[PDB]
Amino acid sequence: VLESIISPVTMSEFLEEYWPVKPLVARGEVERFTSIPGFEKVRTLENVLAIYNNPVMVVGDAVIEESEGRFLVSPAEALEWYEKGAALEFDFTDLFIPQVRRWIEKLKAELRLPAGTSSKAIVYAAKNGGGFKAHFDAYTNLIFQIQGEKTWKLAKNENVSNPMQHYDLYPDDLQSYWKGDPPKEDLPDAEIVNLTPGTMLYLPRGLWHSTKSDQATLALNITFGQPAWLDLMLAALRKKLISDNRFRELAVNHQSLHESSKSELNGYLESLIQTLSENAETLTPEQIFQSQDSDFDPYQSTQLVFRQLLT
């Protein structure tokens, strides 16, 4: 489906040789991006604004400067912002082009991704280039450069294997799987790719990356979540224990309780703990698999409905 974009890499090969850990770069004529449905509605800045009934993110030294200390803004007032140096991000663009939504969903299935995985489109736009510093995300991306050139640094992440959080060149959960020392800010010793119109970059989860640019760019970014097994399993375990009213009862700050009544609670918890262990022990792979439509990314979830409501 995508296979017109990445041709001559097959898809079989994309899934065996590349996804979900090694980036793939695919050069070609920008024209061939038309095989995506809705692509026309996103080929230029003006096309996007024509369609984007939602608040637009604006990012720039021109905001620090017009706030003496990043924000949202009406689409009407957005070209004004762009013409003053300042990057625009149009999140959840798929909301306004149903055809690309239909596609992304087909893509989702092709990537054998869990059905409840988050998926959105975003367009980035900046008149005097820009970029961002070294960091890794927990999402995976297709990036389609439509206009301009952006220069990308890419670097295998040797510190963490399958990260579940964004990080910038450590949070309480990363320290638990971080190993070794980080790479230098300039990502020296990193693969350097310059994305030009018609270039598609598949950006796997966790790959260190930074960008520099000094030309007007326009890019369609497609973002998927990477739900881990942990996620489905806890969901499944949650399905199991949720009917037991004991597990529903309002939890309580330990610190609050007195000495005496605390002890009494350790008895109750220990016993809940037994039931959670018995229930875990009887988890089947089906039960895990059937939890594949749960929300694994409430943070994208809330953002999606909120933008629906602002529409």
Site of interaction with Fe ion (CB under 5 A): 137
Of residues 30 and 234, the one with the C-beta less far from a copy of itself: 234
Minimum CB distance to a copy of itself, residue 176 (Å): 4
Q: Cβ(97)–Cβ(51) under 8 Å?
A: yes
135 labelled ligand-binding: yes
297 labelled ligand-binding: no
209 labelled ligand-binding: yes
| Residue 164 found at the interface with a copy of itself (CB under 8 A) | yes
Please report how many Cα atoms fall inside a 13 Å half-sphere around the Cα of residue 55, on the Cβ side: 13
| Residue 251 found at the interface with a copy of itself (CB under 8 A) | yes
Containing H/E element for 247?
helix 245-248
Minimum CB distance to Fe ion, residue 238 (Å): 24
Closest CA to 59 of 89, 93, 91, 83: 89
Count of residues interacting with a copy of itself (CB under 8 A):
71
| Residue 75 found at the interface with a copy of itself (CB under 8 A) | no
Please report how many Cα atoms fall inside a 13 Å half-sphere around the Cα of residue 21, on the Cβ side: 9
| Residue 70 found at the interface with a copy of itself (CB under 8 A) | yes
Instruction: Tell which one of 23, 38, 55, 129 touches a copy of itself (CB under 8 A).
Output: 55
Of residues 29 and 270, the one with the C-beta less far from a copy of itself: 270
Of residues 193 and 228, the one with the C-beta less far from a copy of itself: 228
Stretch that binds a copy of itself, among 26-34, 112-120, 124-132, 144-152 (CB under 8 A): 112-120
Of residues 138 and 216, the one with the C-beta less far from a copy of itself: 138
Of residues 103 and 224, the one with the C-beta less far from a copy of itself: 224
Minimum CB distance to a copy of itself, residue 246 (Å): 7
Minimum CB distance to Fe ion, residue 210 (Å): 8
| Residue 227 found at the interface with a copy of itself (CB under 8 A) | yes
Minimum CB distance to a copy of itself, residue 204 (Å): 10
Please report how many Cα atoms fall inside a 13 Å half-sphere around the Cα of residue 23, on the Cβ side: 25
| Residue 281 found at the interface with a copy of itself (CB under 8 A) | yes
Minimum CB distance to a copy of itself, residue 250 (Å): 5
- β-pair partners for 217: 126
Q: Two tokens at 106?
A: 């087909």
Instruction: Tell which one of 176, 180, 260, 264 touches a copy of itself (CB under 8 A).
Output: 176
| Residue 246 found at the interface with a copy of itself (CB under 8 A) | yes
For 198: left if phi > 0, alpha if psi spans -120 to 50, otherwise beta; the answer is: left
| Cα–Cα dist 201/213, whole Å | 16
DSSP states along 42-104: GSSHHHHHHH--S-EEEESHHHHTTTT--EEE-STTHHHHHHTT-EEEEETGGGG-HHHHHHH
| Cα–Cα dist 300/211, whole Å | 24
With CB under 5 to 8 Å by kind, the binding choice for 251 among Fe ion, a copy of itself, none is a copy of itself
Closest CA to 81 of 132, 45, 121: 45
For residue 62, what are the contacts with CB-CB under 8 A and spacing of at least 6?
A: 81, 84, 85, 86
Instruction: Tell which one of 11, 37, 182, 247 touches a copy of itself (CB under 8 A).
Output: 247
DSSP state of 204: -
Q: In a 3-state reduction of DSSP, which class is residue 194?
A: strand
Annotated binding site: 135, 137, 209
Binding-site residues for Fe cation sit at 135, 137, 209
